[model samples]
Target chain A: MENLIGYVAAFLTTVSFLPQVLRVVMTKQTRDISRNMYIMFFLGVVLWFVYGILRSDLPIILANVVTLFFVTIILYYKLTEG
Target chain B: MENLIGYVAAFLTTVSFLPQVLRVVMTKQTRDISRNMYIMFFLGVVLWFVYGILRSDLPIILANVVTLFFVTIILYYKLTE
Candidate 1:
């Protein structure tokens, strides 16, 4: 029951980046997106994924994996377009 | 030793939003920043903070607390400006 909260939180936070990616993909506007922010954010997700692997944490691993994918898309647009 | 990794990851991810907030503040550019994204992201941070409280997890709580503050700033700008 308690772990359910974590799952919900994980799900929310994990997919939170999705809207941003979708916005970028749809609009093709990367002008105002902070380049540094995504770079730092991407590295952080990478670390979290690694940390999850070391700890054998499925939620952390899974969440960051999805987050990493979205961030990767944004970073690509930020780099190529911005 | 193992727990240290969590702390590092938490720190990085938590402050990662700072640059974005700073960017918005300095440039006053909300044109490209997605409105729906910050709104949804804010709720997620709130949930995570609550989840930390229930789990009695210090790292989760602390990280989300700081994150909440940063997100609040961005949301404020997104909402007001």
Candidate 2:
């Protein structure tokens, strides 16, 4: 039950970013998507990734790695396009 | 040491959102930001808020509240303007 609940929470939280990722990918317009925001956000995500590693939290680490990938793409587009 | 570590973690995590909040506030343009994203994000934050309350986690609760406020502003801007 505990693991099931954790999985549910993790799935919801992690999957929450999908729409943004998909939209950005499709539109290819991240002009208004504040670069500073993404930079700081990426940093925070990296920190969370580090925190996960430090704590030996596999779920947190996995979730953040995926998020980092999506966010990195957004950041890349922002830089390349604008 | 443990408490201090927790506080430091909380501070870094919470303050990390400040740049985004300030940028959005100054620009007042969030059209590029996905409304669906914010909605789901808001829902997640609310869930986290409830979880924080349930766990009696002051740090989590406080962080989420402030984050919720900033994110809410972005959402409102997305809606109204």
Candidate 3:
């Protein structure tokens, strides 16, 4: 039950960026999505990954890792496309 | 050492949205910011808050609750303005 909640919560935070992620992929434009924001967010997720490792937090580990990957792709498109 | 890392991590993720948060607060326009994304994001944070409460995890509780407040403000601006 607890892990289930964590999983659902993890899924939420990770996929919350779907709308913007799609924009980056299809339109390749992130006018509203500034580079600084993504950069900071990208780095933040990385720290969360580290924190997850240190703390052994499943949702933090799994969700942040997934989010980091998604942020990577989005950040790539935002940078190159610009 | 662990708690420091946790706080730093919490601070990072919490403030990660500052840019966007400022954008919304100053400009009061979220055309580029989709309502659905924030809506889902808001609900997600809410769940984190609940999960934090359930677990009695200080980092999760403190961080998620704080983030939840921030996300709420953003969500409101995105929804109304």
Q: Whose DockQ is greatest here?
A: 1
Query: Residue-wise lDDT of candidate 1 within A1-82, one digit each (tens)?
Result: 5567667777887787788888887887898888888887888878878876886656667888898888899999999948
- Top lDDT: which candidate number? 1
lDDT of 3 by residue, B1-81 (tens): 777777777787787777778877776666666677778878887788787777776777788878878788778887786
Candidate 1 docking quality: incorrect, acceptable, medium or high: medium
* Tens-digit per-residue lDDT, A1-82, candidate 3: 7777888989988897777677666755566665677787787777778877887888878999888888887788768855
Best-to-worst TM-score order:
1, 3, 2
Model 1 clash count equals 0
**Per candidate, chain B TM-score?**
0.91, 0.73, 0.84
Instruction: For candidate 1, write residues B39-60 as lDDT tens digits.
Output: 8788877887887787666666
DockQ of each: 0.69, 0.42, 0.66
**Model 3 chain B poorest 10 in a row by lDDT:** B26-35
- Between 2 and 3, whose lDDT is larger? 3
- For residues A1-82, write the lDDT of model 2, one tens digit per residue: 4344334444555676677778777877776687777776677666766655665556546766887887787778778865
Off by over 4 Å in 1: none
> Model 2, chain A: how large is the TM-score?
0.77
Which regions in candidate 2 have their CA more than 4 angstroms from the true location? A1-6, A56-59, B1-13, B52-59
